[PDB]
């Protein structure tokens, strides 16, 4: 079990960014996205539950971001649109070890830099 996030970079205000994270089986577990400013704490961004259990988003990223998941590729995705300077942070991916979605976030990723 290991996670590796990808897809970040540098981008101007208003443009997009598609993040991805592969797992080293996650079809039964939820994959959440978290971000952290250099001088702040990790805040929740989005969470893709199991296929059919829909998705959930924070208040900061409602309408602008879209979370997805490919069970066949054991990967999660996070499409980001209309990026603001406030969204600039390091983005992490975690697995909710509890199948009941209580959020036992045990496994975490290396992270990816995002700067606007």
């Amino acid at each position: 079990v290991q996670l590796x996030x990808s897809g970040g970079g540098x981008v101007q205000x208003g443009x997009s960014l598609x993040l991805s994270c592969x797992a080293x089986x996650x079809x039964x577990x939820x994959x959440x996205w978290x971000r952290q400013x250099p001088g702040x704490x990790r805040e929740x961004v989005x969470x893709x539950x199991x296929x059919x259990x829909x998705x959930x988003x924070x208040d900061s990223x409602x309408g602008r971001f879209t979370x997805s998941x490919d069970x066949x590729x054991x990967x999660x995705x996070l499409q980001x649109x209309x990026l603001x300077x406030x969204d600039x942070a390091x983005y992490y991916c975690x697995x909710x070890x509890x199948x009941x979605x209580x959020x036992x976030x045990x496994x975490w990723g290396x992270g990816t830099x995002v700067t606007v």
């Binding site: 089986x25 079809x27 039964x28 992490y92 070890x97 045990x106 975490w108 290396x110 992270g111």
Partner: protein, 211 residues
């Protein structure tokens, strides 16, 4: 088209029975194909165990026929696996599959007489000779069962981190280490703490690795 999902206990005592259930969605098990149980040992070796057909006939691996049973429940569209008098050699990840073209996610079953135990965490202090790149880590020794998670600096240190797969010692417990390579210029200014988390024992250890 067809979806499959295994479910069952992940820990079994030796000389006792292991039972698993495969839930099928999108296709009736009475329509066709063989419905097999296939496991994979830690050595990544695959072994087909048994099968039940659409008409209910059974086919078993001769190496397991004295202690295997494959039943089904067509009302719930499920088929089950029962392995009797299991040994530690039966520790593997079990899959259910339809005729070999659709597989489940896989359930990890461990057979052991070991009881739940929290791990001892020891610092792997950086040596006296460090140019350059220094190496430090933590030793997570003697625990049961799998798995255990390790972070560094509450997740603030991910680059250069390597947490090795656990090894089953002769005592029946698991042991691993998590190492991280850092600049030698940071050993005097930057603090390094490893965070070990083992859920079955509800233990959380934070050990500072000092030069």
């Amino acid at each position: 088209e067809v979806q499959l999902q295994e479910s069952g206990p992940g820990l079994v005592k030796p000389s006792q029975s292991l039972s698993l259930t495969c839930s099928v969605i999108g296709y009736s098990i009475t329509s066709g194909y063989y419905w097999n149980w296939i496991r994979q040992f830690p050595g990544n070796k695959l072994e087909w165990m048994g099968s039940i057909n659409y008409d209910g006939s059974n086919i078993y691996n001769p190496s397991l026929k004295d202690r295997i049973s494959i039943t089904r429940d067509t009302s719930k569209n499920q088929f089950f696996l029962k392995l009797n008098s299991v040994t530690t050699e039966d520790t593997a990840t079990y899959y259910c599959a339809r005729g070999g073209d659709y597989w489940g996610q896989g359930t990890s079953v461990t057979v052991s007489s070991a009881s739940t135990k929290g791990p001892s965490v020891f610092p792997l202090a950086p040596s006296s000779k460090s140019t350059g790149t220094a190496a430090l880590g933590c030793l997570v020794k003697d625990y049961f069962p799998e798995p255990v998670t390790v972070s560094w600096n509450s997740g603030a240190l991910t680059s250069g981190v390597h947490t090795f797969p656990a090894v089953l010692q002769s005592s029946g417990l698991y042991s691993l280490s998590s190492v991280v390579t850092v600049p030698s210029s940071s050993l005097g200014t930057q603090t390094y703490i490893c965070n070990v988390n083992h859920k079955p024992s509800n233990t959380k250890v934070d050990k500072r690795v000092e030069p």
